[model samples]
Target: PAPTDLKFTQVTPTSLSAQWTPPNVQLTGYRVRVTPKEKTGPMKEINLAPDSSSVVVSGLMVATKYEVSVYALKDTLTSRPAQGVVTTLENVSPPRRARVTDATETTITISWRTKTETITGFQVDAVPANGQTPIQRTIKPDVRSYTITGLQPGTDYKIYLYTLNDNARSSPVVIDASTAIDAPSNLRFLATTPNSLLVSWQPPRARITGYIIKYEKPGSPPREVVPRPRPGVTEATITGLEPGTEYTIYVIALKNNQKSEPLIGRKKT
Candidate 1:
């Protein structure tokens, strides 16, 4: 009689494993045949002992189906074949040059470069390194960029991309990125003395370590004052200026070594 319960155990881009139960009656060995479904040249063959129940076929084509059959053998004659089918998965390649192209306080755009003919599409996962919730998205093979939104400012993120086949996934290509910090707001001249000025502003809600204040007369290099206030303080004073002079004032936020967009206003002392 033929072998019983023939089935494929493992399937990959270049390999397939066929397994079966031995026949009930006495048998010598088994002959296994692996034939491509679309008739692509000569079929592959494997001969195994009666005690063996599985065979692995390697160096096969990807993304294609094959017809597998197992025959129970006795002395010089073989029984009918127990038949089944399996398909090899496509081996997609991962993309390269993964990087951040643009960023704002709450959004970052990541891009990569790759070409694929056998893959179905691509997938992206944006996860903050600080253990925030992750975002996943899918795109066509030709779509080379995606913007990840709802992120926190001044935070580092590990963004990942992968090539996707019909039933397989490539290794991940990753990029480390960060969103820009938000600038201070409500900047104004609180009071001005003959040779000094006091300024106040609203602190940005980002993880700011400190603030820097810049003031200059138009067309001249700006002088910067490093504020010693704690992160909770949102006010500063600039002294030692020419009396009755008008200048451009900027209040900026900082976290780590990253600086935010400047909060600009005009003030006079």
Candidate 2:
């Protein structure tokens, strides 16, 4: 006779335990056989003493289906088999590394490395540190990288990564990154005088360090003018120039020494 009450317990990503009842007739031993549901490889079997009703099967695959059968054995004769089915839990191998590949004013590119045998997909989130809504993306299981866009520049961000399987996620891994600062836009002269020019601009949407003012006349060498730091400053005055000559000026926003592309302006100073 076949074993009775075949049941599975302690199911995990890589192993499972099975239990069953002895048939009414006496038996010498039981045969416990395990095989991948795909039926692509040799099945595993272990003979157990007749008193044994539970066995913890190891060395199995992750997040996969398996077939287990227990047969009543009487000396050389084998009885019908009682069977059970189980699927391993989601494999919880998070990406080994999440790194920033490139960053721009409004985008961030990230990549990672990991074992791909069982994981189905990867999910990423770019969370701006300033309490903004987080941007999220899900990548194909075969794709190892992603770029997140529509972000704020010159800001801190937390890059969160998770391994996806069985409609579940592993504990996320976090890495830090920042977007490149943006250049000031719409630069033009507010006022031009005989020896000076006052320039204004739409400052970049960042907490910029300050500004470096560069201006050159028709025949003079370019000079970098250090403006007196202003509170919430978006404009500056460049003085000590020839009275009525043409000047080409550039106002480069500063993050310490990180310079933005020059905001170009022309005027007669």
Candidate 3:
């Protein structure tokens, strides 16, 4: 039996759809087998649906992955599986990094790259690790990321990013970045302390394995804070905050290889 023109048409993280043109030579049907993650296994045989070249599969979770292959058969003789990677879709590998917007207290925009396998869309899971229920949403297959809505002000949360292909999923990467604390949580600032300002805010989510801080004087672009965070520290006090002067502060949180949104704060020295 000659190899059929097996092709993966729809690829998701766990599940994928395949189709094919009938083989050039006469054959009774096709044999199909899916390896878990393209693993080597005894290829399974799937009887054709009467000249049909397409099939759909389901039952996959979000963010895990799968591999697939299909081929031709006649009587007992069978052809080899196709030679290509049929990876299900997955979330962006190195997620798109950004800081929360200063103008909105109720929303945060996130961008990430979905693994380029094959799929039509993605499902995003914005999970709050601080005992709050998670927020789940979906985006068009063409969209790389999305913004969450209805979040509380001055709250910190964990972002569980799952990449989806077909019905399969890639492994998840957690984003423990912090959002701006909407000024109401603390109130210990005195104008007399111009050269020095009391600095305190909500800690980064525990999932934020590491962090970075950047600052800029009024009328200047922000720059990264040198000597990044030590293990397990979330708060810091800085000198040179001029009295009656304005400055912008930006903070970044990191987990594994992914970075969290920038937490922005401003004050007059």
Give the C-alpha miss distance for residue 209 in model 3, angstroms. Answer: 26
Q: How many clashes in each candidate?
A: 0, 0, 22
Stretches off by above 4 angstroms in model 2 are 1-82, 85-90, 217-222, 243-245, 255-258
**Model 3: residues with Cα > 4 Å off, grouped in runs:** 1-17, 21-31, 34-39, 56-99, 111-122, 141-145, 177-269
Order of candidate numbers by TM-score, starting with the best: 1, 2, 3
Model 2: per-residue Cα lDDT at residue 146:
80
Reference-based lDDT, each prediction: 0.82, 0.80, 0.56
- For candidate 2, write residues 1-269 as lDDT tens digits: 78888888677676788877787888698888889887566577888887888898776776678898888899889999999888877667778778889988788988888865567688987799875688888878888888888888787899898887645577788989887878888887888889998888888776788877788876787788865445278778888888879999887777665677778979997
Each candidate's root-mean-square deviation in Å?
8.6, 9.8, 12.3
lDDT of 2: 0.80
Query: What TM-score number comes out for model 1?
Result: 0.68
The alpha-carbon deviation from the true structure for residue 142 of candidate 1, after best TM-score superposition, in angstroms, is 2.2
Distance (Å) between predicted and true CA of 76, model 3? Answer: 9.8
